Amino acid sequence: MSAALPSIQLPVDYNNLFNEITDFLVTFKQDKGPKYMAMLQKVANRELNSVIIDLDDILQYQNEKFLQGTQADDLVSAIQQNANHFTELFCRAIDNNMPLPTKEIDYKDDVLDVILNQRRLRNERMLSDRTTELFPPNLTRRYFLYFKPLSQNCARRYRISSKPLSVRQIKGDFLGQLITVRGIITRVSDVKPAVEVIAYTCDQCGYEVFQEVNSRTFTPLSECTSEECSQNQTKGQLFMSTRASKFSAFQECKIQELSQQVPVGHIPRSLNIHVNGTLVRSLSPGDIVDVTGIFLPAPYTGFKALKAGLLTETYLEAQFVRQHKK
Amino acid sequence: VDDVTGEKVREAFEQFLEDFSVQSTDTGEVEKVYRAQIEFMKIYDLNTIYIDYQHLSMRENGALAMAISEQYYRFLPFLQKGLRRVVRKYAPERVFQISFFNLPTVHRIRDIRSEKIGSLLSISGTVTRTSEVRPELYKASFTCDMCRAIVDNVEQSFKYTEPTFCPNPSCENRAFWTLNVTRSRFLDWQKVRIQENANEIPTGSMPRTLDVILRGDSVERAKPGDRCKFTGVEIVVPDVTQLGLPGVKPSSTGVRDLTYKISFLACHVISIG
Amino acid sequence: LRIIWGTNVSIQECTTNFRNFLMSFKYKFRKILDERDEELYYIKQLNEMRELGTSNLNLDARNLLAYKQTEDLYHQLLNYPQEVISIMDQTIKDCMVSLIVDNNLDYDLDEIETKFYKVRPYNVGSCKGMRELNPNDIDKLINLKGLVLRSTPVIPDMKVAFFKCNVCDHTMAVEIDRGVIQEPARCERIDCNEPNSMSLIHNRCSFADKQVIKLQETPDFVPDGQTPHSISLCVYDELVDSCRAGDRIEVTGTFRSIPIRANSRQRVLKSLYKTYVDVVHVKKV
């Protein structure tokens, strides 16, 4: 709109940069079949659920069409500015180019395998006897995505995001990039079941409503808004169930300084770190580790007292850890 | 329904104390002792009775006391009205409390379970941390925006609220909780913390407690540290302070969650031991 | 077949093999041990239990591993630990009918049939405390080992609710049947033609016991970062006051997660959940 929330144009565009993601997928020849064929299908065969995309392959794939053939925009320097919008969209390319019925639909290798089929077939049973809302795409993933930086030889050839920065070097302008730090993990908490999507049940009209989940705050719904119950005086009372939703693991820790990068003056500091996904229980206090991952601020929490500097709380998501003293 | 059987326990109890429950003649207890218990309170006016539990169950052979042992809470409207039909045929600023004693069993603290809410039972324990004597409302006179301050009825419960129907002005149910002290009848009560007796319990692991309400004319009869038996009722009190150990507490769909706990009520305390 | 919609359990007139399981089981668990007693355990306990009526069936339950066509309910036991037990509680009331219709009339006609019963099975394998619990196995039977820390007194529960109107008309009750109680708007002997305020008299309505016990497990095989971990339990009426402080207990039960509040006065919820173990059977000291 005009005169309030205006439109600033940017030199970086996002329209064309979906297609070069698709050509970084299974249509790939640098590594019989490519490496992104079988590792996708092995996950589709329910043998793994942690798809670790490397970043060095993005760099070598760029040189295959850099000065050779066509001209294309840079993506590794595009990741090193945003680093978060390339997480939900990099998975958006996967679900189209992935065969689902490759594995058997047999008995329990994981729970919610029979009910998700009943979740999926009832939704087509909802859209059968009518003569158009389906399950949200972030619900049905059943894997994860990660990234690893580059430090050894690829930068020396032709010139980043793998320098072992200390904790005190983290300025305010890195908020939104990929960083790598080091230190001593302390005060580590346990694993607690979080939630990322929520399934209600109206119990009268049957239509299960959902919503999305953001950090530390979410609001429950009102009574049912589905069109079978509503537009009348009789509206169903909806109730949350736990056997119908997706949960995940979650953990927290604090990284101090390594006491060699401390100055002779100021007293050592700490950052908060949330570990989300299948890398849970992979850390232990009192060691020397090298943590990578995206670095984004925590949003507004209520009561409006300490706020308007937002209480940003500067936490740090994790993507890949590299230990020491193996 | 309950109005029907509520009058049946009323008319039986009204017919009970008009008759005698004591058999031994020429050595005391002759000719309707409960009529003789009335006239002694007619001279002294302390507004209580002390009737036996066995002597109720000897006449009808427990045909009545099994309801009074079970649904005790619902019958105190109907037992008070039944007693007040008697004395107005006998005696000419009045309130009355009905105390029982001489129970067969003595229960303990560890046998307290919620299948006996509104029932009658006794308990033995040790008295610790008594408190002060304070008035409680029990009957209000809440006015309205018009000059008619007529408020001698509804909302005498455990909520400190005022009434909704019978409007004095032409308006609807306006603001509430007013207590105009010109006409309101307060009684007195105090709060003590009973603790389980030492020579019953197993290996010492902080034995559990209760908080007991002593209503009426039983105040300052509990000494700090002596054993006692008590009366039957076991109420549950709404509270707000219970947090930190959550369960499934049902909500009220003004939103308010409901947190309940156990509190004991008495009417007659006897200091045995 | 009218299979339950979200539960995938076979409907009644199919779970009658539990009756046949209850009658024929003599050496099948001793097939592993190579016979190093000739009758069934659960015949003789059934004859002594009807005398007193206080059911509390132990049910060692390493018996659905070795029997003909009972592997499917054993695998539907762990995946659905609530519904199949409550379904079995009907049959544990119904199998006792099968003796009274065959044998002579016992107990001065009947009363023990109107008593409900519970089944408290255990020994579902071996789980590994709290640290190894993944959050994706929500409702499974878990074996837990640890000592007992400080306990709490008895907390009542609304099981039957009750209501009243300001008019002296008929006072009718309602049940909860869910997490939240509901209340109507109108009544019979309606009460000013459906205009009234529903009152809640909370002393005449029935109740149910609940004690929360804070268990401390023993996280052995230490990774040299060690928390004495706290796990809350939610024991119910039959097994209250059976767990003193300072005792190592093997316990079995289901596993839950309940949303919590942020201000405890607003309508917003906290995203992270809290876990507790709703127990079913407590065995040993």
Cα–Cα distance for residue pair B214/B13, rounded to 1 Å: 25
What is the rounded distance in angstroms from the CA atom of residue C190 to the CA atom of residue C192?
A: 6
Instruction: Kindly state whether residue B144 falls inside one of the protein's structural domains.
Output: no
| Containing structural domain, residue B12 | 1-105
Picking from C135, C178, C229, the nearest residue to A193 by CB comes out as C135
Residue B158 covered by a domain: no
C-chain residue closest to A198, CA distance: C271
Q: Give domain limits for chain C.
A: 1-126, 127-285
- Are B57 and B114 in a shared domain? no
Q: Decide if B235 touches C, using CB distance below 8 A.
A: yes
What is the Cα–Cα distance from A255 to B224, expressed in whole angstroms?
56
Q: Same domain for B31 and B86?
A: yes
Mark whether B11 and B117 lie in a shared domain.
no
Number of separate domains in chain B: 2
Q: Which of B66, B88, B105 is the last residue of a domain?
A: B105
Which candidate from C257, C262, C267 shows the least CB-CB separation from A193? C257
Q: Given CB atoms, is C185 within the 8 Å cutoff of chain A?
A: no
Nearest-neighbour CA in chain B from C172: distance (Å): 12
Record: contact C139-A243, CB cut-off 8 A: yes
Mark which of B83, B105, B127 sits at the end of a domain.
Answer: B105
State the nearest Cα–Cα gap between B266 and chain C, in angstroms.
16
Cβ contact (<8 Å) for C262 and A217? yes
B57: domain CATH number is 3.30.1640.10
Question: Which residue of chain A is at minimal alpha-carbon distance from C258?
Answer: A242
Resolution of the determined structure in angstroms stands at 3.8
> Any idea which residue has 């006792």 for tokens?
C96
Q: Cα–Cα distance between B129 and B222 in angstroms, integer?
A: 11
- The answer as to whether B148 is a domain residue is no
Provide, as residue numbers in chain C, all residues whose Cβ is less than 8 Å from the Cβ of A242.
138-139, 256-257
Residue B35 in any domain: the answer is yes
CATH of the domain at B132: 2.40.50.140
Q: From chain B, pick out residues whose CB is under 8 angstroms from the CB of C179.
A: 248, 250-251
Query: Chains A, C: CB contacts under 8 A, how many?
Result: 86
Q: Is residue B165 part of a domain?
A: no
- Indicate the residue of C152, C156, C166 with minimum beta-carbon distance to B260: C156
Distances (CA, A) of A272 to A297, A314, B95: 11, 7, 67
State whether residue B1 sits within 8 Å of chain C by CB.
yes
Comparing alpha-carbon positions, the chain C residue that sits nearest to B155 is C166
Neighbours of chain C (3+ CB pairs under 8 A): A, B
Q: Do B74 and C204 touch (CB under 8 A)?
A: yes
Answer yes or no: do B42 and B130 share one domain: no
Contacts of range B238-246, beta carbons closer than 8 Å, 24 or more positions apart:
B238/B158, B238/C202, B243/C264, B245/C152, B245/C212, B245/C232, B246/C258, B246/C260, B246/C274
C224 DSSP 8-state letter = S
Q: Which helix (H) or strand (E) holds C282?
A: strand C279-283
Same-domain pairing of B41 and B119: no
Does the beta carbon of C264 lie under 8 angstroms from any beta carbon of chain A? no
Experimental method: cryo-EM
Residue B166: CB atoms within 10 A of its CB come to 12
Do B21 and B127 belong to one domain? no
Chain B: residue whose CA lies nearest to C155: B261
Residue B255 to residue C267, Cβ atoms within 8 A: yes
* Distance between CA atoms of residues B167 and B149, nearest Å: 10
Interchain proximity C182–A284, CB inside 8 Å? no
Beta carbons of C280 and C120 less than 8 angstroms apart: yes
Distance CA A142, CA A98 (A): 12
CB contact under 8 A, A242 and C138: yes
Tokens for C37, please give them.
Answer: 């007693």
Tell me, yes or no, whether B65 and B128 share the same domain: no
